[PDB]
């Protein structure tokens, strides 16, 4: 049941893709550490909540 993923390597030693391994030991998912591989989204629901979203090169008001 081991889980294997690539690390995003910052400073590289003078030695390519490096991995790490994770194994959940407990039944309850609450017991689990954080995966920290978190996806992102559009600010649009906050930055542009408009019914008619307009293109930036055209007049905001028309």
């Amino acid at each position: 049941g081991a889980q294997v993923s690539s690390q995003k390597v910052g400073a590289h030693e003078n030695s390519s893709t490096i991995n790490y391994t994770t194994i959940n030991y407990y039944k309850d998912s609450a017991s689990n550490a954080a995966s920290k591989q978190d996806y992102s989204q559009d600010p649009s629901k906050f930055t542009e909540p408009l019914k008619d979203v307009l293109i930036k090169t055209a007049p905001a008001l028309n």
């Binding site: 049941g1 081991a2 889980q3 294997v4 993923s5």
Partner: peptide, 4 residues
């Protein structure tokens, strides 16, 4: 195992 599960390799991602």
């Amino acid at each position: 195992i599960s390799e991602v």
